[PDB]
A paper describes a structure:
L-arginine oxidase (AROD, EC 1.4.3.25) is an oxidoreductase that catalyses the deamination of L-arginine, with flavin adenine dinucleotide (FAD) as a cofactor. This enzyme is useful for accurate assays of L-arginine in biological samples.
Comparative analysis of this structure with that determined using X-ray crystallography reveals open and closed forms of the lid-like loop at the entrance to the substrate pocket.
Author numbering:
A (entry chain B): 87 to 212, 214 to 256
B (entry chain A): 12 to 594
C (entry chain D): 87 to 256
D (entry chain D): 512 to 594
Write the structure that this text describes.
Amino acid sequence: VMVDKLVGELKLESKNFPMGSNLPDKDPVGAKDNLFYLRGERFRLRDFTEAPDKIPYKLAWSERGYGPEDLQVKVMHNIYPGFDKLSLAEQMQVKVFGKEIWRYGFWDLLYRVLSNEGYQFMKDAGYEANVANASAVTQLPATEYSDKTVFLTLKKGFQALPLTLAKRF
Amino acid sequence: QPLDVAIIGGGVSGTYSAWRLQEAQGDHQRIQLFEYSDRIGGRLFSINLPGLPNVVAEVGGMRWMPATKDNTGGHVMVDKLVGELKLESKNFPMGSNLPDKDPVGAKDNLFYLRGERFRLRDFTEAPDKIPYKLAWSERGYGPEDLQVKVMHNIYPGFDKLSLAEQMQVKVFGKEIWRYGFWDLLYRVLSNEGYQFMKDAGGYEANVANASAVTQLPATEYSDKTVFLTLKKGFQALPLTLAKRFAEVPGGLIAGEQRIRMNRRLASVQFSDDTEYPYRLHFQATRTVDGKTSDVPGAEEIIHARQVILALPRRSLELIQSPLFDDPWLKENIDSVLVQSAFKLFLAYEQPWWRSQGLVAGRSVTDLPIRQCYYMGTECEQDGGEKTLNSLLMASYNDIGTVPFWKGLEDGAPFEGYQPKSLQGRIDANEVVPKMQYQISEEMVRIAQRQVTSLHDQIELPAPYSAVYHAWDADPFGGGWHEWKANYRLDLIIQRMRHPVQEQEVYIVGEAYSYGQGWVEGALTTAESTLQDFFGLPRPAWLPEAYQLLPAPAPVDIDNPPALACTDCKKTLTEVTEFAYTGI
Amino acid sequence: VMVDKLVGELKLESKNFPMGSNLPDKDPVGAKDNLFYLRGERFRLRDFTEAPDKIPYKLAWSERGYGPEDLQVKVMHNIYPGFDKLSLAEQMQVKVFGKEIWRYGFWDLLYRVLSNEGYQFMKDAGGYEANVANASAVTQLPATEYSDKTVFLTLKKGFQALPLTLAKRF
Amino acid sequence: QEQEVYIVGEAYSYGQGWVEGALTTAESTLQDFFGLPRPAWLPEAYQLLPAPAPVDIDNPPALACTDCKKTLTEVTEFAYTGI
Ligand SMILES: Cc1cc2nc3c(=O)[nH]c(=O)nc-3n(C[C@H](O)[C@H](O)[C@H](O)COP(=O)(O)OP(=O)(O)OC[C@H]3O[C@@H](n4cnc5c(N)ncnc54)[C@H](O)[C@@H]3O)c2cc1C
Ligand SMILES: Cc1cc2nc3c(=O)[nH]c(=O)nc-3n(C[C@H](O)[C@H](O)[C@H](O)COP(=O)(O)OP(=O)(O)OC[C@H]3O[C@@H](n4cnc5c(N)ncnc54)[C@H](O)[C@@H]3O)c2cc1C
């Protein structure tokens, strides 16, 4: 809100920072037709669901047939249904296999609820870093990376907000 | 009364330094070694887990390459002082001696990468089972074997060149030492064959991008390579030294004041005493159960003629001194990459691995354990207990930070369980050793969980004892050091013995040796300093044959004369036969 | 012993029990060639080691290449190296997964020391069929009495001969 | 132990499912309670029925791993077969 409305008062211009194809406009293929090149095998984002045989990760039967962004949400609910819709206050009291979830690094969790071939997977296909074991209460509902969510960019470049903040100062 | 020399840091480097000196120039000068902690040996650490009193769990150093008969090759320094100080040495096995007839060695040792299980033999026996898209050319070489194919592919014989000649070898129009290690391999290997070697070979997640001139002839770690660890555990050497130091008859100072422990150097300063331009302001340091913290007390100051710093990179970085301002020493303390080291030991009443035709060596996996080593069974040891108690070593990953071996360091502590073999001999509060780090009820459970999987098992017998340790804490901030790239190790290997000439300060340690991550590296750096800058001679136990340090190439690597090749008629022939192996 | 020595003092006729084949004279198949017909796939005793592909039981990797006996022996050395190289008293004092081995029912141990597929296997391939006993494992585990090299004997006049000869003698 | 009724058979023997069971039970029952000698044909070595463990094994003394140097070799060599 702060960024959308501040750009508001500062009357700086906005563009829709595009994450997918709007072509065709009959049926945009979003990013479905966007590329993936892991374990010396090429496929697409559509292949994850449309042709899970094409994915060269020996993941379990329970994990087969989900894109990685969709698999994060499976893990979350598996852990607890609704985490995303909880308040931080509440999300801190949530516990997994005994410990509160914020006592888990983001991978000291994944390697307990996913297969190692799901663990290695998500990694290769997040920024390898991704979280380098960031608290799991922050890094688990990181399911806004989608092309389904919206994103706006400054036309004059994002650096125009702090510059325009300096000048008006 | 003031000190002529102050060998600061009680590492294998320090302990060797003070010894020879007092031995020779000790009635002639006031020599004193200064230790941070309650323990000599430094990285060399040797605990005996309860129930395994004859299965040393070397947390730090473990083995050493035996000397060759020409004595110019092998960990010559280590392997002659192990005789001189007279210390017991057993073979460090990497393979299985059984079957006596046709010893499989490490061939049968396990691999679990990308959720598929094979063995070292399945490389040269059935590559079909490697679940990596290695290109035709590369398909059929073992991790070790591959590295050598690449090496050769570069400048045939790279392993045969002296450091001097090696440095001058360019590849694709660049000095080999200008490339890192991976940066190189991601131009000679398929991106799978790259990934593949990054998942198996030598250490682990380590093999960090380091000067290719150090890390390309790093194939030594094979199952044909002989190796020995001290019976008493590697810490034995830098203690017999620490003892032997204070045990020299001819001395100005008696043995009781010679080895001053629980003394951490915080400031080296230029005094006014033109004879002791070194005001060392130490601080009191107390060690409770491996965790040494500071006693605010008073910064005790002792006057020194010279201070032989036997410290690795952080250890140094931790002293406040105008000496580190020297522009060279400012930018040549970053010549080496700090890389952390973790390690888990688990004690079992049964070596369940034997039931599965694995004896000694390691097994590799895409699981966080990444590595695992089978050590030995107490009763297999020469005049050991009559127990089937045994030791599995692991957590031998090796990475920057926030990995998965620091992600389970918290919760509740593992107490373990009194084995039948230690009933009324030791208490369940005393089974799991209290170390600097206390392995948790959680880290044990996950480790075991993972170990099970690795070995394709349903459930293994729970361990009774378990210790975790790390070298990611100051005063080390890292296990072993590896030379960075676009650096001239050849020169720095020489000039870190005396960073500043005018000033009589000498830094010794593996941290700036050719033998980085080796005890040889720390002995060599010390010895070649004693000889050049303290005029100590070659002792009787060291051959002259063994060149201590390697030939520094000229500073003029600008367009030097081309290296006149030798027996290509041989070289190229060994290079071609070596490629018939993989076909 | 008692049978081998009683049939001695009773001077009764002994003959070999061939749990296998004697041909060819040079290098006998022993059993090896003997038939199996599990899970609608036919195979032979050899095809366990020679040709594991052919075994229709999806056993784990560590479990492939043994016969049902051989497998049992692995498991037993797993439970405790040289468990068969003990006395009964010593065997009652061996603990696995916290419990004395003799508090486990056979199967109830296998499932925790073997794959289900390996479990089923051994339950679909044993000596006395339907070994089903969940019997004190301390007795039924070291049953390494079933092979093509394990020497067996019978009585020419049949095993009923032993009781009768005693009854006669009596 | 008050009565004079004795039970022999394969059922309550270490030799269950075998004859030897029947023969071993009976003999010891005779050698012990019927005062019979040991047949000159039945060798002293052969222990008929196995000996029991103490009736308290709640905290058993650790078995003396006499020879592992031998045992662990074979256990290993046994594994190398199934590779
Ligand atoms: C995990 C691991 C495995 C290894 N395995 C092997 C192996 O198998 N074979 C082999 O040959 N080598 C091995 N090595 C290498 C071996 O540990 C080194 O050769 C050796 O321990 C380093 O000696 P050093 O003198 O360079 O310093 P260290 O041994 O690190 O000694 C440094 C000393 O400085 C002291 N110190 C720190 N700060 C201060 C201060 N302010 N004042 C005073 N003292 C201070 C410390 O307390 C310590 O005693 C291994 C190393 C690691 C980390
Ligand atoms: C299918 C099968 C295969 C076997 N294979 C082998 C083998 O290969 N090798 C081997 O060594 N052993 C084998 N055995 C076991 C072996 O036959 C027995 O262990 C042996 O017969 C034991 O004799 P016993 O006296 O203990 O009991 P039994 O043979 O049962 O003797 C009991 C006797 O008492 C009689 N009886 C029972 N109740 C009464 C009553 N109320 N009044 C009077 N008489 C009564 C019975 O009719 C019988 O005559 C096998 C058993 C079976 C069933």
